[PDB]
Every structure is written in C-alpha cells, then in structure tokens.
C-alpha cells in the first residue's frame, strides 16, 4: 500500500528549515474545542446537517429556521475556547515571526477560535458566525450580540422535534445603516456560493510561495478548500496531514499524522 509517512523526525527536518508555512484548518480543529460542526461526525441540528441549512435556497424559503441554526451556533460559543492545537499554531506563528519566518492559517472554520487563540495571519475563507451581511445593501458588520435580535432569545434548540420559531422576517436581524433596514444574513459562505475573489487571490499567493504545508483537521471533502493542499503537493512541496482519520486526499501528501491535533501539533510545531 501507498500510505504517507508517519515519521515525526522526517517532518521536523522540513519544519526546521521552512521560511513560509501554510496551515489549512478545518472542522476537526473546532470539534476538538467541542464546537458542533453539523457534518461528518459533528452531529445534527434537529433533522438537519449543515449541507441542508447552509444554502441560499434554505434561507430563501425559511430564513427564520436558518437564523435559528446560526443563533444556536453563535450562542454555544459562549462555552467553547481554543484548544492545544489552536495554541500550538498561534505560538508557532509568534515564535517564527520573531525569526522572520512566515506562518499563515487558512481556515474553513467560522467560529473565530484561531483569532481568540492569538493567530494574526488568518484567512477566514468561509466567513464568520460573528459577522452579518445585508441582503439589500451588502454591508458587512461585526456582531457579537447575545442574542443577535430579541426574537431569537431562547430559540435555536437543537433537539429533534423542536418546532420552527417562525419569526416574522421584520423581527429577524435588520440592517442598521441609514436608509436600508434590509434583512441581514450570516456573513458565511454557503454551499452553492462562491468564495470572495479577494481572499482567493490572497490564498493563491500563499500557496504559490509556501515551502511547507500542513492540513489539519480537514475532512478534505469541502471544495474549493480541499484542493489547496493537493495543489501545493503537486509543486513538490512537502504537505503533512494531521487528522483523526484518512481522507480522500491523504495519498497525495508526504506525511499523515493520526490523532487529535491537540496532541500531535504541539509536538510537531515545537
């Protein structure tokens, strides 16, 4: 069989010399903090997974339901914090940056735990649970309010059987800019939407110049993110995958380190 190396010594040879390290992170990193991701092993919200609710069409049809889901997700972050994987990554960035070596995190996650852990060079390619965008005027705003709007207070219960709140659109979250009052939506990239062109340019720049790439906690089923680390590997650059399981991309990489990132990464990035 054709399986990548699990030699930490061999990895460390590349790590010691890298001037430009790209770390791609996914839902497995957030899962280690207890964040429910609602895909793969990450559970269900009522009857649904993220693929069912995080879509333009779900939000067209039942914007109260989609906002209930995102509200639940916002509110549970109250009890979720960065883990040893987040900290290994942030500390590595800090330590390497003092030596003039660059570390950039490209994250699929929307829960801002890499920000909270102190990562500075962060590309949030799918947006943020704590940002809104207006469906009419297009302005993006940071929003941490708990609850986001009065009508959502105590709604979002995840239990199967929980009935739709059916909040009238006028009482869901609304633009507060002079003269808009649009419906807001979460500033999150949904299935079926494209990624911001500006961010993808920044991503391609990092991938084209990096000399080592880590893919951490990624199922490597969500595109286009899942295509980033294979592209690096095809330039001959070493790519190490850190994940609890093998994925469809595993055999494209030079290393696979099995386990929770919070166990493997502090060792790898030391």
């Amino acid at each position: 069989s054709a399986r990548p190396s699990s030699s930490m010594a061999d990895f460390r040879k590349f790590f010691a010399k890298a001037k430009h390290i790209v770390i791609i992170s996914g839902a497995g990193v957030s899962a280690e903090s207890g964040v429910p991701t609602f895909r793969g092993a990450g559970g269900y919200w009522r009857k649904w997974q993220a693929q069912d609710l995080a879509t333009p069409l779900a939000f067209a049809h039942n914007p109260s339901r989609v906002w209930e889901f995102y509200h639940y997700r916002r509110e549970v972050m109250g009890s979720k914090e960065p883990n040893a994987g987040h900290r290994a990554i942030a500390e590595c960035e800090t330590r390497l940056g003092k030596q003039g070596r660059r570390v950039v995190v490209i994250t699929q996650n929307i829960d801002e735990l890499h920000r909270k852990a102190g990562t500075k060079n962060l590309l949030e390619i799918h947006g943020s649970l704590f940002k809104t965008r207006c469906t009419s005027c297009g302005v993006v705003a940071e929003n941490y309010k708990s609850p986001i709007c009065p009508a959502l207070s105590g709604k979002g219960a995840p239990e199967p059987g929980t009935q739709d709140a059916s909040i009238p659109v006028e009482k869901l979250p609304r633009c507060e800019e002079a003269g808009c009052g649009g419906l807001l939506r979460p500033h999150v990239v949904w299935f079926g939407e494209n990624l911001d062109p500006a961010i993808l340019e920044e991503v391609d720049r990092e991938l084209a110049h990096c000399d080592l790439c880590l893919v951490v906690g990624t199922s490597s089923v969500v595109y286009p993110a899942a295509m980033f680390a294979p592209q690096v590997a095809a330039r001959g650059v070493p790519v190490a995958e850190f994940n609890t399981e093998t994925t469809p991309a595993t055999n494209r990489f030079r290393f696979h380190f099995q386990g929770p990132c919070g166990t493997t990464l502090p060792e790898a990035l030391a």
Partner: peptide, 7 residues
C-alpha cells in the same frame, strides 16, 4: 466565481 460544495 469560485463555488463552495461538498463531495
């Protein structure tokens, strides 16, 4: 555009 999906 460059579009989001899951396999």
């Amino acid at each position: 555009a460059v579009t989001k999906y899951t396999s």
